[PDB]
């Protein structure tokens, strides 16, 4: 808000390299998603140590 | 059933693998594989330690299958693994012909038969030739 009430669509920009040096095409998509979702996940493995002093992963 | 005799005592433990090997010109062997339990503590947690400590290298090892003698040899090569909470031990046992295999001897054998050379050559361990 704070200035006006026009929508801001999402824009999908594309490149070719890892960095931003070589731009490919770039579209903005109408009809916003209603919901995004970004899932994080970290993999842990349990230490099966024979000494049995501690439990850890 | 299957009863593992070691040094004359019937040695109540748990065999997970037994394999007895016997060929045509080779020393017959027998692999065991045991599991020493760790998760059941108390009186039978060090009483199983007493039964594995009797497995010294070179002992009379006897296997009996359905009240018949299966293997009957001396013990070689006791390997133990201990990965995680598992603690297994692996045995091997070789026949009385194992006493003949790694010591370089020298004899001459003049004026003797094919059999009298060899029945007096197997006799050094207690192996009785039948021919």
UniProtKB/TrEMBL annotation, chain A:
<protein>
    <submittedName>
        <fullName>Afp7</fullName>
    </submittedName>
</protein>
UniProtKB/TrEMBL annotation, chain B:
<protein>
    <submittedName>
        <fullName>Afp8</fullName>
    </submittedName>
</protein>
